[PDB]
Design a binder for this molecule. Structure first.
Ligand SMILES: O=C(CN1CCCCC1)Nc1ccc2c(c1)OCO2
Length: 330
């Protein structure tokens, strides 16, 4: 089997991407944030605290003849950005782009943090990291990919995010029309539960390539590109007027600037991030100071190949017995 779904930016900055997901019988369609940085499928629901729901589409398990309460199970997640949610669990039929999983654990939110309430465009998350990070207790649950894998034509999914435009999540097959050149695969460590790999280096704009190992994770659920302070400093040093601002919380730059590209290595291959992909607009409405799309990972504990980077590539998440990651230009 295979599945193919369109993923759409939630706003004009590509702050995140939502993919429609069918849950239950009859289907209830919710727009979820596919996150290869986490491993919980959770949704806004008829159980969520009233005051914490503002615009979201909710899952109502009582209206689904295939929903079953997973007795005693609870879940609680805290993301790297300080956001969080928690609640109880059902199993139900979940379909993504024509691909169906029966008995998928659907984590029903009773509580969500302010930042989730405040974004009416995201109805929940669908995690695509390794199930070792799943937060369900006392019986840890499998991710959608994990549940479908044996059934897929090939045990893979692919992320094809667009820049200021919709893209595609495919399951069980690689679309050889969606990229240029060849796909370069690279080793993954599953030790921390993430799609963790090692980039071979970078270049700034038309700069020379610097050979250097950068360990990080492929994270579709993180918007920006978070790299070592040295790297980030070398990038913003090419933009006149750019500065690290503690008060805004990162590198900002004059909105009148033309940003240079950023290249990262994948083995002997190179992925080029165009300068415009690194512009995240005024720091506040009407400001002529713009927020940078490349930021320091110092203080995070890990480097993150966030959407800013992934959207410049066609990315293969190969969940074979020994997982690997694949990157192609497009
Ligand atoms: O919290 C996030 C992303 N976040 C995920 C939940 C929705 C809002 C965006 N960043 C993040 C993502 C993966 C990480 C990490 C931090 O530290 C380690 O792995």
């Amino acid at each position: 089997s295979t599945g193919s779904a369109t993923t759409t930016p939630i706003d004009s900055l590509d702050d995140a991407y939502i993919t429609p997901v069918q849950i239950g019988t009859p289907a209830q369609t919710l727009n979820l944030d596919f996150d290869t940085g986490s491993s919980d499928l959770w949704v806004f629901s008829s159980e969520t605290t009233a005051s914490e729901v503002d615009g979201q589409t909710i899952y109502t398990p009582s209206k689904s003849t295939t929903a079953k309460l997973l007795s005693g199970a609870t879940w609680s997640i805290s993301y790297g950005d300080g956001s969080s949610s928690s609640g109880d669990v059902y199993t139900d039929t979940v379909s993504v782009g024509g691909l169906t999983v029966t008995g998928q654990a659907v984590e029903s939110a009773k509580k969500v943090s302010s930042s989730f309430t405040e974004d009416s465009t995201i109805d929940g998350l669908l995690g695509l990291a390794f199930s070792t990070l799943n937060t369900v207790s006392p019986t840890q649950q499998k991710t959608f990919f994990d549940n479908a894998k044996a059934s897929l034509d090939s045990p893979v999914f692919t992320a094809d995010l667009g820049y200021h435009a919709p893209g595609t999540y495919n399951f069980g097959f690689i679309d050889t029309t969606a990229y240029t050149g060849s796909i370069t695969y690279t080793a993954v460590s599953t030790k921390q539960g993430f799609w963790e790999w090692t980039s071979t280096g970078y270049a700034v704009g038309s700069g020379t390539f610097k050979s250097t190992s950068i360990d990080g994770i492929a994270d579709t659920g993180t918007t920006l590109l978070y790299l070592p302070a040295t790297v980030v400093s070398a990038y913003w040093a090419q933009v006149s007027g750019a500065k690290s601002s503690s008060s805004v919380g990162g590198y900002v730059f004059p909105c009148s600037a033309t940003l240079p590209s950023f290249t990262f290595g994948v083995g002997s291959a190179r992925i080029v991030i165009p300068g415009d992909y690194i512009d995240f607009g005024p720091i506040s409405t009407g400001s002529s100071s713009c927020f940078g799309g490349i930021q320091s990972s110092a203080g995070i504990g890990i480097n993150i190949f966030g959407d800013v980077a992934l959207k410049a590539a066609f990315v293969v998440f190969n969940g074979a017995t020994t997982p690997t990651l694949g990157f192609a230009s497009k």
